[PDB]
């Protein structure tokens, strides 16, 4: 076992960008404990000339997630899955019956 | 919608889908084992897979609820599944 080199504890958002901007591979990331939102975790990631931050969300059950993807209609769900797999273990993309 | 097939039975959806050549060929039908629900049937290989269209209190539509029990699992998951919706960002260890 080795400590996870991506957990940085409490460090300023600015210092995380400064640090990650020096990285050369898109995706270089770190998890930090937010200062502006006590109790929350933030994901900082390098991408191009920027550094993006994602707030780690939670639900009443204590789950951790970045997005809640749902739709208002079946047609909206259909379009989404034309480019995003409908399966978790396989890559299946919806395409019209011909 | 041309992908909606109303009350076609699960068995008939399979017969129909099994004759399509492209993986991904699908149709949405009213669930037969669960009245009121919707089912997505899709071809893949020599099989036809069925998915239940899930709903929530707000009456939303989704196939899966992807969540994690720990930051550790959320991180590892996004090492192969993008963190961004509009860009391809896969978590990679700092070097």
């Amino acid at each position: 076992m080795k400590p996870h080199p991506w957990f940085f504890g409490k460090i300023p958002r600015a210092k995380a960008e400064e640090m990650l901007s020096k990285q050369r591979h898109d995706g270089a990331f770190l998890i930090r404990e937010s200062e502006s939102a006590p109790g929350d975790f933030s994901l900082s990631v390098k991408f191009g000339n920027d550094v993006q931050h994602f707030k780690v969300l939670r639900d009443g059950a204590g789950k951790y997630f970045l997005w809640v993807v749902k739709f208002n209609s079946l047609n909206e769900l259909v379009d989404y899955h034309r480019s995003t797999s409908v399966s978790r273990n396989q890559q299946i993309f919806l395409r019209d019956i011909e | 919608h041309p992908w909606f097939f109303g009350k076609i039975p699960r068995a008939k959806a399979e017969e129909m889908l099994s004759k399509q050549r492209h993986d991904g060929a699908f149709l949405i039908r009213e669930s037969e084992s669960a009245p009121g629900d919707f089912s997505l049937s899709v071809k893949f290989g020599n099989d036809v897979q069925h998915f239940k269209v899930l709903r929530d209190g707000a009456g939303k539509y989704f196939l899966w609820v992807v969540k994690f029990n720990s930051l550790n699992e959320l991180v590892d998951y996004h090492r192969s599944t993008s963190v961004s919706r509009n860009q391809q960002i896969f978590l990679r260890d700092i070097e």
Binding site: - | H50, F51, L63
Partner: peptide, 4 residues
């Protein structure tokens, strides 16, 4: 169903 694959997802249930």
């Amino acid at each position: 169903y694959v997802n249930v």
